[PDB]
Structure 1
Amino acid sequence: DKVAVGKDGMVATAHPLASKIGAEVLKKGGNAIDAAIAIQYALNVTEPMMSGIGGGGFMMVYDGETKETSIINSRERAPEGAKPDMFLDEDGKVIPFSERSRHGNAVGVPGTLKGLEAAHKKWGTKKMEDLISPSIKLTEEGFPIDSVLADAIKDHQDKLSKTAAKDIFLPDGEPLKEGDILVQKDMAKTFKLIRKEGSKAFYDGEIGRAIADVVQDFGGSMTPDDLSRYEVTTDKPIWGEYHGYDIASMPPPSSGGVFMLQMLKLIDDFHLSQYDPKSFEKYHLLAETMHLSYADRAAYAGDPEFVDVPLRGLLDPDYIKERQKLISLDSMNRDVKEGDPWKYEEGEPNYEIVPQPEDKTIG
């Protein structure tokens, strides 16, 4: 079921066998964070191509109670061995996305596990074992794969062959079809181990070292030192108001918050709801607006510990006005360039504008 209503809780997840599990947490009196944690493990098992403890995330929570809003930033970090031009070949040319995509250098230190643990105790009021067990059952005893997972495996036959994954996702010759049962005994092993010795099995354990092995085996420079150094952060949201509402979204090192808000700010003054939703007018104004914001992102997005991002300027009322000049019903803007938000924020860039190519997270 795709829609639903609740009084004492609610949960909506990418996979029905994740949902479903979060709901059980709430039914037992556990809170949203408890449930969120449970869901992430469940998704890791049931939607393994999408999210995982071998990756990162941003967890936005609104507190109780405290009534403040915060964000567990568990995005991966590059190992100390990584290099600014590690993605160029020996001729100084960018290495094809398909190739970069799989290389050891691509793998950043996974942060999700520490982030779940951070959230748990900041908020969590259950575990340190209950929330991971149901995912261990699905890993150990398996489950039938849905359309989307089936099609991931088919669309990525060639990547999946190259790796240890082929034994279990490409069992004999071919890739599991909808309904086939996916069992991840080794993943269950790891999850049981996470339950017992906590996170440190990961960042100070055999798994951490295991990962360091493979990243190097595939050309990467990850050491267990890198893992042991890794730290999640907490971020306070980027805010903004629109149609009389306060929106809390992601700050750098995500591009999401700023430019989604900027997109709204730009589009607001046009009052699109005059136009039919599926009208030329609309799509064009949306399109033109996207072009501007995405151009700004290409020049000025990045981890603020390392760079200065003009958050004030990018969302300035006067910047919006300047840029809305570009957006008309009477033409498509051909000169798609970044704006100068520095004219509105004290400071200047500690970086240049490098034009870039094509990143196959597409077809």
Structure 2
Amino acid sequence: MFTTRPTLQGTFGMVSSTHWLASQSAMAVLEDGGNAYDAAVAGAFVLHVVEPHLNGPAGEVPILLAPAGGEVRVLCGQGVAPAGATVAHYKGLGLDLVPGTGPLAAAVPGAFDAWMLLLRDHGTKPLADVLKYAVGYAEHGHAPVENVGVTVETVRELFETEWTTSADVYLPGGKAPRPGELLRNPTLAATWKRLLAEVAGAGDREAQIEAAREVWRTGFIAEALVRQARRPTMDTSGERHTGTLTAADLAGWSATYEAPATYDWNGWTVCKAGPWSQGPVLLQQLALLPPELPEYGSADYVHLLVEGCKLAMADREAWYGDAAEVPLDELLSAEYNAGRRELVGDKASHELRPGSPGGRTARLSAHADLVATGPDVAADGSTRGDACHLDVVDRWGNMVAATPSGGWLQSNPVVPELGFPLGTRLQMTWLEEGLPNSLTPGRRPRTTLTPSIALRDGIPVMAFGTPGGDQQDQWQLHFFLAVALRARVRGGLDLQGAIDAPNWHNDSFPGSFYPRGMRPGSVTVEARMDPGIAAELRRRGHEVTVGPPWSEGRLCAVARDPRTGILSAAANPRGMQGYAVGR
């Protein structure tokens, strides 16, 4: 059975990411004696340079780490809303939704501190050695994918007319980035060099990293961000607004560790970030499944999965966030889920139906209620396209999986003394009080960013993820199941066959991104899915959209066979960008 790449197999290390430049940069770290965490940090910073349309240094990142011996652990690099970012304030600006662009959408940037923590607690390499790769591609250049330049062109009027600092970087002399020529960001290069120069004398290896955390937090980086945040900036609303972001918000905030949300299923345990992310929706879909699944890849299998996802997503909308306690145990309990799988019926649901965990009655946002009636980038700079992904496993068996995002070029003006813009993750909160995901000071917005680590018999086995917003834990569920249900290839998990497999998603819920619309009953399948499966689904009431052959999922996966010690990896071929490397 043909696969677009091999599921690579080896004994030294594996990397999977959404861009080959990042994968090979992370692998170069392993080849120089670094570990999985050293490698991820390096890959992450190259990812800022090579996918600036999908992430950036001022974005955010959840990291799942599975060190060889010990506990699976989450490192939360999702920042919070500013102290001054209240519903009342945003309501006072005449807003009904948080804007998709501009400084009002910016959470405290969380990703940088998170990488530094990972580097200092679990790394072995210094900062300079781990980010020379990014610096090199920033100052000397890299040949970009067509999506970078296309993204810039879409947002050109806005850059030239309004966000002129972004025009300085991305439209030098009016010239957008082009494939087959070297794209540079000399300012981003300078920022890291300066960071490295004023941290060099700070002491031992970790003292340097810790002083770099403070340079970000309180030094020249922080100064510039706040200054930019407070400059009146055109946004999606059509008015120029200012951010509430403050020197103190930055000075106070750190990335934190926490236990994963986990769910045992069929000999495996899937590990995710807590319900401040969408991570637990994957888990909820597992618990929804009966012990007896239909024939893999079949019309009954898909339908079952689509209806279960709708159920599970309704619960995230209703229950998930960081402005209230989330009844997660009850949502993953067998009693609750036994009740819920009965709601999966022969016809396709066009409704949003959250359940009542622990008898609690569901509160939905007015806008969510309203939207439930039953392109990548706009000229605005409003977007759907979301994030990168990066997975590493090393010779010692350490695993990481991270989905960094935010701080992309389309949706905020570049901070001129730094070279990158502020993020836009507050767009996923509600401007309504009393909700789990109410925009709230000191709270993370409920984020789409959702990496995965799978265990088999309680042993860390597979580290994987994908970008793509509200598709992230849809594509990953279809992926993970196929790994578990498909036949082994070369006596190992069929990672690439699972990735290659036709994939799908639905939009039958309010979307995380501005303007937060929904399409009741809507499912989208790749054109290579059997056309009789499409036929069955429409028969069963689904509003089926037939997208292109190679359009669904940007999956990454690394894996370790625990009995044999053999590392493997796979990557998504769609968009000819994602790539696995290893040996």
Scaled by the length of structure 2, what TM-score is found? 0.56
Match of 1:247 among 262, 267, 270: 270
CA distance in 1 between counterparts of 2:293 and 2:136 reads 51
Aligned to 1:317: 334
- For 2:129, what is the secondary structure of its paired residue? coil
Structure 1 CA distance, aligned partners of 2:119 and 2:45?
Answer: 14
Q: Which amino acid aligns with 1:94?
A: D
Number of residue pairs matched?
346
In the alignment, does 2:236 pair up with 1:222?
Answer: no
How far apart are residue 86 of structure 1 and its match?
4.5
User: In the superposition, relative to structure 1, how do residues 321 and 159 fare at CA in structure 2: closer, same or farther (>3 Å)?
Assistant: farther
Change (3 A) 1:113 1:360: closer
Match of 1:24 in 2: 28
SS at match of 1:320: helix
Q: Post-superposition shift, 1:199?
A: 2.2
Q: C-alpha deviations, 1:141-175, integer Å up to 9, x for none?
A: 11111133233323433454432111221233352
Bigger proportion of residues as helix = 1
1:182-331 to 2 correspondence within 5 Å? Answer: 182-196=183-197, 197=199, 198-217=212-231, 218=233, 219-256=242-279, 258-269=280-291, 271-272=293-294, 274=295, 277=297, 279-303=298-322, 306-328=323-345, 330-331=346-347
Within 1, Cα distance between the matches of 2:287 and 2:125? 41
Alignment-mate amino acid for residue 355 of structure 1 = A
> Deviation of residue 269 (structure 1)?
3.6
Residue 39 (structure 1) aligned with residue 43 (structure 2): yes
Aligned-partner residue type, residue 263 of structure 1: Q
Report matched runs for 1:156-195 at 5 Å.
156-161=155-160, 162-163=162-163, 164-195=165-196
Q: Which residues of 2 match residues 71-110 of structure 1 at below 5 A?
A: 71-88=74-91, 91=94, 94-95=96-97, 100-110=99-109
Q: Answer yes or no: is the 8 Å Cα contact 1:209–1:223 preserved in 2.
A: no
1:338 corresponds to which residue? Answer: 354
Structure 1 residue 336, shift from structure 2 partner: 2.9
Q: Map Cα deviations across residues 236-273 of structure 1 (whole Å, 9 max, x no partner).
A: 111111121111111121122x110111221344503x
Instruction: Give yes or no for contact 1:104–1:220 (8 Å, CA) kept in 2.
Output: yes
Deviations 1:87-116 (A, max 9, x none): 44755x525x7xx12221111111111111
Q: 1:180 to 1:87 in 2, by over 3 A?
A: farther
Q: Contact 2:138–2:189 (CA<8 Å) still a contact in 1?
A: yes
Q: Check 1:224–1:27 CA distance in 2 against 1; reply closer, same or farther (3 A cut).
A: same
In the alignment, the residues of structure 2 paired with residue 138 and residue 244 of structure 1 have an alpha-carbon distance, to the nearest angstrom, of: 43
Distance in 1 (alpha carbons) for counterparts of 2:5 and 2:173 = 35
User: How big is each residue's C-alpha offset from its partner over 1:182-216, in whole Å with a ceiling of 9 and x where there is no partner?
Assistant: 11111011111232331222111111011101111
Distance 1:232 1:90, change over 3 A: closer
Looking at structure 2, the residues matched to 55 and 249 of structure 1 have their Cα atoms a distance apart, in angstroms, of 19
Aligned partners of 1:22, 1:35: CA distance in 2, in Å? 4
Equivalent AA in structure 1 for residue 52 of structure 2: P
Distance in 2 (alpha carbons) for counterparts of 1:334 and 1:123 = 46
Distance 1:288 1:320 in 2: 14
* In 2: Cα distance, 1:159 partner to 1:338 partner: 39
| TM-align CA RMSD | 2.3
Q: 1:153 to 1:268 in 2, by over 3 A?
A: farther
Partner residue of 1:59?
Answer: 63
1:312 to 1:158, Cα distance in 2 relative to 1, 3 A: farther
Is 1:111 the equivalent of 2:110? yes
Tell me by how many angstroms 1:129 deviates: 1.4
The aligned residue for residue 365 of structure 2 is 354
Deviations 1:206-231 (A, max 9, x none): 11011101111131111211111111
- Which residue of 2 is the match for residue 131 of structure 1? 130
Alpha-carbon separation, structure 1, partners of 2:303 and 2:92: 39
Question: Does the CA contact (< 8 Å) of 1:150 and 1:177 recur in 2?
Answer: yes
* One-letter amino acid matched to 1:52: G
8 Å contact kept, 1:86–1:105 = no
Q: Is the 8 A contact 1:259 1:293 kept in 2?
A: yes
Supply the AA of the counterpart residue of 1:185. Answer: P
Give me the whole-angstrom Cα distance separating, in 2, the residues matched to 1:90 and 1:79. Answer: 16
Q: CA deviation at 1:32?
A: 0.2
Is contact 2:293–2:301 with CA below 8 Å preserved after alignment?
A: no
Q: CA 1:180 to 1:269, structure 2 compared with 1: closer, same or farther past 3 Å?
A: same
Stretches of 4+ aligned residues off by more than 6 angstroms:
none
Contact 1:105 1:220 in 2 (8 A): yes
Checking the alignment, whether the CA contact within 8 Å between 1:313 and 1:342 is kept in structure 2 is yes
Gaps of 5+ in 2: 200-211, 234-241, 372-381, 386-512, 514-583
Go from structure 1 to structure 2 and tell me whether the alpha carbon gap of 1:158 and 1:241 turns closer, same or farther (over 3 Å shift): farther
Superimposed CA distance per residue, residues 247-304 of structure 1 (whole angstroms, 9 cap, x where no aligned partner): 1111121122x110111221344503x15x2x4333322221111111111111111x
Q: In the TM superposition, what is the alpha-carbon distance from 1:334 to its structure 2 partner?
A: 4.2
Name the CA distance, whole Å, in 2 between partners of 1:173 and 1:288.
Answer: 48
| Cα distance in 2 for residues equivalent to 1:243 and 1:158 | 53
Aligned equivalents of 1:183 and 1:360: distance in 2? 24
What SS does the corresponding residue of 1:189 show, helix, strand or coil? helix
Question: % of aligned pairs identical?
Answer: 26
- TM score, norm. by length of structure 1: 0.88
Does 35-44 or 334-343 show the bigger shift? 334-343
